[PDB]
């Protein structure tokens, strides 16, 4: 029971953001329509693609290894999550590099602190977890 | 009970994305408003149409073969899913081919890697499934025969 | 219980799409702002109107024939569903007919295939259903007669 | 129990549409930005206002006559519902009366059939209901 | 149980509108981009701010006086509710005062009727409530005294 | 049970706003497209980033210290909440600073009041809470001692 609730809630939660954030970003890109443009195209294309994985995983998990797909799901979500933040930075870039280049720097500069803590917080949480799997084993 | 929850949650989940992704894409296309344009019109028209199937399936499943429609539903969703990803690529194309054509190439190029793994991951998951339907069939019939043999 | 869940889930599901797809389409039309324009105005006006029916039905079903309104609801949803798909096609038309008319044809042409299978898939599913209502009816009277025969 | 579910589901359902349709219409009006303009301003202002009633009713019903507010709620929703349809028609009007006036006529003309069946379907359903309240009484 | 459902449903309901209406209004303002402009900036800034309160209250209520915060929540929601309606009026103003000033008057004029009934309906409902808290206090204390008198 | 509901409801509630408010703000910024611009880029970049934390926390909490992450979650949400309100102000600024600078001042000026009460209301609620944790602690040891005294 406690295992079924953790799946049902998570299922809706994942589909929720993926579709929203993805669809939102797509609309954002086309809305604003030198070198950074090479990233804007890739950063966006990856976002939609990454989230799709999570969504397609939301379709395959219902019928059905559980600890394997569970990872593909979480990893996909996280990958897409960081990307969305990566997206906003690129936007400030292009959205400002035409009329106000000076302010744009702060956007990419302010991204650095947060991007680090993000991937960092994920590590600490994971490390403490592996320690438990071993602790319980002994 | 475990079967009813898997349906209720799935039902809302499917309707959720279909309506959102579809409606979102439609707004995206009209928002930006050479040859690629032939695809942008088709790629989008299919997306809305494909998702609609899933939605219309969300309406017919409630009243009511179950393993048949279940496929039409999943297949539709998956088809629409890949399309959305196909959509974003086409957008980078048109959204850039005017001012910055050079970067656009990466978008369609970076799509290839992901599009493959997508349709590929769907195959591996499906294959492992069919193997189980057969596995259960053999073990199941065997156990039964064992009982049939002793009955005699 | 199984009947209450099928209603609660369906209720939210219907309201969900209707409001989303409807509101989305409305925003789409005004966003882009020869003969096809006569359809764009009608196709859209119907979409909002059709979905509204389903929504207003979501309000009247809670208090309260059940197989009658159930049809008005499903029919409305389906009508609005096909319309949304009809909408996207009209959009490619107007969204391209200004700068790129040539590609637009594929959109309406590609729509035909899918639109057919859509209304077609709905028929096959419905037909198989009616066959069951009859099948169960015959089986039902038979079981009863079996009991009536032994009673004697 | 069957009474609590009918309230919880209805509650979310009402809030759902009201906020969505209302917010959507508002965005629609400002997006496009002779005589019909007098209606576009009134038709929209009423929509947001009407739905708000339903929303504010979604806040007061939780604490707490039940058949009275139940009416204000349903009536508000229905009023806002018809208005949204009324809105789309007005949009085709203004959205076309600049470049393509000819097609606009169909929008308002096609609205008539549906608007009638709408208010009509509401009557038939209500009439059959009153007949039951009397039937049960006898 | 009946108290937990009233909280869970209300929680989602509040977060729902606040985020939607707020985010929607913000997008509306920037979308259209003499004296009324002084209000458009304030009316909007308050809306987002007011709803935020309700949202932040949706975060603090889960852990945890109950009749106090319950008021801050309801009051915030209501304040934001009326504001949204106040917003639409201001929009007709700015959205029209450029090309069609004449029609705009009706928008602000038609707002007056509804804005009054809104704050008015809130009063009647609240008044009837306070009357009950007092009513229960008297009947409740009376029943108790009746028992206290007999005890002696 | 009462602990599982408080988590499930909160989970959806958090994901809800984060994705909505974040995505909405992003669309708002690009939609409008002197010194304040330095803030608009930073204020927005932080919003998306902050909310992401809450979202990523919505993914890690399901598997699994509870009072620690619970804080990172609430703190993140609150940080993002205030930012959204900070965002609207910056918008009035840029959205008006071009054509109508005079009215913009009120937006940032009107923000001060509300921003204060916001962070202030959060403090009062928290303070009253800590007082209870201590109150219960004293009462708890007292009840126990009462039993310890009688035991003797």
Numbering used by the authors:
A (entry chain B), D (entry chain B): 148 to 180, 189 to 219, 240 to 313
B (entry chain C), C (entry chain A), E (entry chain C), F (entry chain A): 148 to 180, 189 to 219, 240 to 327
Provide the authors' original text about this structure.
Orai was identified as the protein that forms the channel’s pore and STIM was identified as its regulator. The channel is activated by the depletion of Ca2+ from the endoplasmic reticulum (ER), and as such it was characterized as the calcium release-activated calcium (CRAC) channel responsible for store-operated calcium entry (SOCE) before the molecular components were known. Each Orai subunit contains four transmembrane helices (M1-M4) and a cytosolic M4-ext helix.
The density is positioned roughly in the center of the basic region in the structure of WT Oraicryst and located in the lower portion of it in the structures of the K163W mutant, which removes the top ring of basic residues from the pore. The K163W mutation has no other apparent effect, and this is analogous to observations from structures of the quiescent conformation with and without the K163W mutation. Congruently, we observe that the corresponding K163W mutant of Drosophila Orai can adopt an unlatched conformation with a closed pore.
